[PDB]
Amino acid sequence: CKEFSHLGKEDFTSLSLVLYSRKFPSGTFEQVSQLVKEVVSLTEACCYDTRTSALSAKSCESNSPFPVHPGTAECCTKRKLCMAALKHQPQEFPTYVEPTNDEICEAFRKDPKEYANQFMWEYSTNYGQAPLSLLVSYTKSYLSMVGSCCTSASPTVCFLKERLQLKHLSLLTTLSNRVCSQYAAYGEKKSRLSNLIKLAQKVPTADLEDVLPLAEDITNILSKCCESASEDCMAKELPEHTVKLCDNLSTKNSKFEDCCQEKTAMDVFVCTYFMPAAQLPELPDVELPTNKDVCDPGNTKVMDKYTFELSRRTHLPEVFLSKVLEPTLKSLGECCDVEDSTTCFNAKGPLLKKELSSFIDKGQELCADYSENTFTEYKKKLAERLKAKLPDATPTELAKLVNKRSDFASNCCSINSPPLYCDSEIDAELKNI
Ligand SMILES: CCCCCCCC/C=C\CCCCCCCC(=O)O
């Protein structure tokens, strides 16, 4: 109620559209607009579960106006406020594409309101994991640009200049959506390890000491800035993070040196982000940390050292590594709070080693040749491998397997593969062939 008054009607409604578009990434323009239509109608005539209930209720109605969370129609079976318990899944495959200047201005003069609403909805559903404060700030600035540029002396020049002034906020928002989505999908502890893994893969040359502080720092920034309703801090924190990146890795790797030479902190960050897993020196094998030092609740130095060492020695994608480390380390951890840890470790050790080895072997089998070749060249070697394992396979059957397996590998064998999507795709591929 307090916000509705201080913000007004139209503005409070704008905030809501962005707010609810983030919540229902899969929702349609119509549905989200409809839900917001009545959420305001509520606040207004209540500034009260008389309307709050009418909302949750009219939400289950088969073929309902409102957008639906996965599990809504399910747990609706009725309390009945299970809906608030349901967590929303991010959109990992953004499809937002900015129209041409003409497309923008024609749409804008014809219907200024719906053009801005369609934009706030589509931009927010696509990059809904970026901080609310940032989305609101970018979409308001963007609409202001559209507003002034389409009626300027020369829209073309206006747009060229104004988009340049907005590039920073623009890249910051999509970048923030990407890293915060990964953060929300994994949770703080796994995100931290995930980032430690990726840095290890990008610079196996470095020592644990060069990358750990960085995994720590990015993690601190995300837990602090990924969620803010009015004052964004991603812009305040990320630049100094690139300074740490360069201080520690600028001289440890040629490619990092080049990244660190770019014009802005944003460019340095993006550049390091897109950097793929480099060729690994292939050092000696590393045994699981089956020792009392992993029991330190105060530190994770041991778990971090193992994670780091495993990453710079095992040619496997981070989505795979992060996936198996969690259960593995948790299993080890079960030998901590017992009367005799040594006996527990000596028993669990041989078992975890085989399970890990099996997972790793299968994962490297699923991603074989992807990283070292161009997609096309990958597709070619992949077929040869399949041909050798399936001599009686018709060319059609081989084509289908090549298609399926190359689809999986393009989605889940890259350093920046989608966590949520791959988690389930990996489960399936593991019990394959
Ligand atoms: C989702 C990643 C799974 C990776 C498997 C590596 C081992 C993890 C350790 C313990 C969890 C158990 C899962 C394996 C099934 C066998 C059951 C058993 O532990 O006896």
UniProtKB/Swiss-Prot annotation:
Major subcellular site:
secreted
In its record, the post-translational modification comment is: Allele GC*1S is O-glycosylated at Thr-396. The trisaccharide sugar moiety can be modified by the successive removal of neuraminic acid and galactose leaving an O-mceeN-acetyl-galactosamine. This conversion is thought to produce a macrophage-activating factor (Gc-MAF). Only a minor proportion of plasma GC is O-glycosylated. The potential N-glycosylation site predicted at Asn-248 is thought to be nonglycosylated.
- A Pfam family reported for this protein in Swiss-Prot or TrEMBL: Serum_albumin
Stated consequence of mutating T396K: In allele GC*2, allele GC*2A9
Where located? Secreted
**InterPro entries in the record:** ALB/AFP/VDB, Serum_albumin-like, Serum_albumin_CS, Serum_albumin_N, VitD-bd, VitD-bind_III
**Which CDD domains does UniProt cross-reference here?**
ALBUMIN
Which Gene Ontology BP annotations are present?
vitamin D metabolic process; vitamin transport
Supply one GO CC term from the record: extracellular space
Q: Does the keyword Hydrolase apply?
A: no
State the SMART domains in the record: ALBUMIN
The disulfides recorded in the entry are C1-C47, C60-C76, C75-C82, C105-C150, C149-C158, C180-C226, C225-C233, C246-C260, C259-C271, C295-C336, C335-C344, C367-C413, C412-C422
Q: What is the effect of changing D392E?
A: In allele GC*1S
Keyword Cell membrane assigned: no
Q: In which tissues is it expressed?
A: Expressed in the liver. Found in plasma, ascites, cerebrospinal fluid and urine.
What molecular function does GO assign, one term?
calcidiol binding
List keywords of the entry alphabetically: Actin-binding, Disulfide bond, Glycoprotein, Repeat, Secreted, Signal, Transport, Vitamin D
Q: Where is the Albumin domain?
A: 1-168, 169-354, 355-433
Q: Which family does it belong to?
A: Belongs to the ALB/AFP/VDB family.
> How does the annotation summarize its subunit structure?
Associates with membrane-bound immunoglobulin on the surface of B-lymphocytes and with IgG Fc receptor on the membranes of T-lymphocytes. Interacts with LRP2; the interaction is required for renal uptake of GC in complex with 25-hydroxyvitamin D3.
Function field: Involved in vitamin D transport and storage, scavenging of extracellular G-actin, enhancement of the chemotactic activity of C5 alpha for neutrophils in inflammation and macrophage activation.
Fetch the PANTHER family from UniProt.
Answer: SERUM ALBUMIN-RELATED, VITAMIN D-BINDING PROTEIN
Name of the protein in question: Vitamin D-binding protein
